[model samples]
Target: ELITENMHMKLYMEGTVNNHHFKCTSEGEGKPYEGTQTQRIKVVEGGPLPFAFDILATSFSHTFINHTQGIPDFWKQSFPEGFTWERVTTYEDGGVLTATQDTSLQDGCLIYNVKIRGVNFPSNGPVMQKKTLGWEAHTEMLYPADGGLEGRADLALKLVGGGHLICNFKTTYRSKKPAKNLKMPGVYYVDYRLERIKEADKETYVEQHEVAVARYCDLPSKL
Candidate 1:
């Protein structure tokens, strides 16, 4: 009989979602800005795999801050008047998971999709976690990306007597053109770390960790 198991996950993202205007245009990549977000996930039932789950709860908070200084009208009428641009945005939601086989890689990592619904926010309006905003990942038992020759050959065992399995991967998203009337094309570079807890020492579990800080880079000039 399969017994009930629990796992915990923490996600931290801090970086700029910048829009650098096309060089052809008058506004030349006017000062990039930054945003930060953190999320916590609790799995009351199920094991580490993405498909094995009964209930999952997630809480997240984010804020968008301006980084432009000494630049007149940096935003340049991008936002409407009477809008409060400096405030934190928060939401809580439930997650549903599904998986599919990926044929591109030989290592048997599967493609996992997560749909976030039942969003509760202070604004009292229905917010859609639409196709554009949904979560997708390549799930694997081991770190899939190339860490190093040693990392690839090294077979580190899971925490003895049952502990947590830490999985790290990169997520990338690209768009042909900028959306939402933004000037520059959009590209996303994110690194995700997922933790799956097993039976182990109860008192000394790792609680918090840091991921890479977001950096600003221009898309290929021609593209």
Candidate 2:
């Protein structure tokens, strides 16, 4: 199948977070708990040749335990002083996609126009102001857990298959016991133009320019 212009697709994914295994005591005296997270993604295609997509929406859920020990007086911290995992809410509105191409459709495979756009976290390296273009892809922590792991990033894209694409990401923090817990899942919409950048020695092209915002999850939970 050939993915033409003005086409759209939806992807749904579900995964688990093994918070049970995340056994790390805080600097002081704080209890850990079991945790799980969920997310939703969507994509839409516009025009032909160099197809472009608008990352429709995304949602997330994160749960953790609270500790009596407030911010360590002398411990080094990244966020502002007296910062704790009270809660984390991310809202983004931006779309990303690859450039247009006239390639042949592989056997049993539709020529798909795939694009990816994600929320640029504060820790995604440093943002250069007067050097590069609008925004650069700096390094970012993946995991969203506190005092646990970093480098966890959620992605949204437009599929090229015959039906609505279903996608989900889950991580488990297994634990021996349970304590304070919570669940958070919200949709983040995207809207912006996309520019493609082809690497010198790579097969894939990257989006050069794009803008995003965090809007309420407009897609349904189950589709």
Candidate 3:
């Protein structure tokens, strides 16, 4: 018998940032999930690089909470005064990857943000492929449930390319629970997805990709 459902999201973004070709993707699964982000960069006009080479960087995290169950208790159990997860990052040629996270109150709302330091290629070394870059970070803004937007999760990524990528990602469950108890007595299902684009623009944007799933079940429930 299945007790839980599986949900996940995949993200991709590519563009020119600081005169360099850049592309990145992040994918993961679970209510409290784990995923990885791969970033690639190449010199287009020779802004920063001793020699022409392609840089590949990957960042991974084991714990990611985009949302909780509909119950208020689940909400508090997941995040108490917000939270932070550690990211392991690697980059080409042993490039330095340093990233951080912070939370603040803005316009009476919680604003969380992650910052990635600009890449400075090492002058000497054998180029490393699929290396970890400086640590990249992600932020999630939290709002009170009574405020009309409860259990809202928002994330934004700063690309090596010139623009920023933003994602408003979340997940919820539908159950076949008995109505009298409002408890799911059988199988449950969930769906998850997100999108990103190169060069933030309503028109003339050259590249974009989206990842999503519908009616995913983790296990089959015996009736």
Candidate 4:
């Protein structure tokens, strides 16, 4: 059958911080930047292969970031070709996803990485200032299957390092439905897991493990 909204996959993350004493939180809608939300992944397959896309592509779209230096130092090196930054206007929308060139390290690491910022709406109208910080990662071209492609992504937010915030996200895409140039909701699936990464010292960083898998009825527009 074609990849529909029912099509979904699982995700899991396992990373360590500095090796200190720490605790992790579960899925919830907390204050501004106080907790983590359910993780989801969206995959666009059937397009180009290698240079087409990766896990970082989709994962990077749902992060709500507040970098003072605009696109950050590491971003410039990867997206050397250039990139575009914008604000997410949809509440249901996850966040903005920007692409840039990476001129730093060399070794066939793909150079560029996607930048994702998390965002939450205020019940009392739109606020000009930011309330929290968010982050995300993507992995494209995961594998090849029956006349189609596969991929995954990870979406997360930052706490303690900044302020308190709540970001709830759901993955839904355009599907072949019935509407003037419109389509039904394609199948956007994700896997959620919890893990603790310990280091030599004690300082530790809490990570919400996430893995997203998806397939497309057609190739992505970008490709």
Most TM-score-accurate candidate: 3
lDDT of 1 by residue, 85-151 (tens): 1112122222211111111111221111232222222222122211111122222111112211011
Which segments of candidate 3 are over 4 A away from where they belong? Answer: 1-80, 104-108, 118-195, 198-223
Candidate 4, residues 76-191, lDDT tens digits: the string is 22221322222222232233222221112222121123233323323332121222233333322223222222223333433334633223333222112223332222233223
TM per prediction:
0.23, 0.19, 0.27, 0.22
Higher-scoring candidate on lDDT, 1 or 3: 3
| Candidate 2 or 1, higher TM-score | 1
Steric clashes per prediction: 0, 53, 16, 46
Off by over 4 Å in 1: 1-38, 47-180, 185-211, 216-223
The residue ranges of model 2 lying beyond 4 angstroms of the native Cα positions read 1-157, 161-164, 170-205, 208-210, 215-223
Model 4 poorest ten-residue lDDT run? 26-35
RMSD of each: 20.9, 21.6, 14.8, 18.6
Q: Largest lDDT belongs to which candidate?
A: 3
State each model's CA lDDT, in order: 0.20, 0.21, 0.29, 0.25
Q: lDDT of model 3 at residue 186?
A: 24
Name the better of 2 and 4 by TM-score. 4
Kindly report which residue pairs in candidate 1 clash with one another: none
lDDT of 3 by residue, 1-223 (tens): 0112343434333433223444444443333322221212222232333322222222212122332233222211322233222222333334443433332222322223343333444544332221211212333232333212222233333434434333343322221222232322122222223232232221122222222221224368897
lDDT of 2 at 187: 23
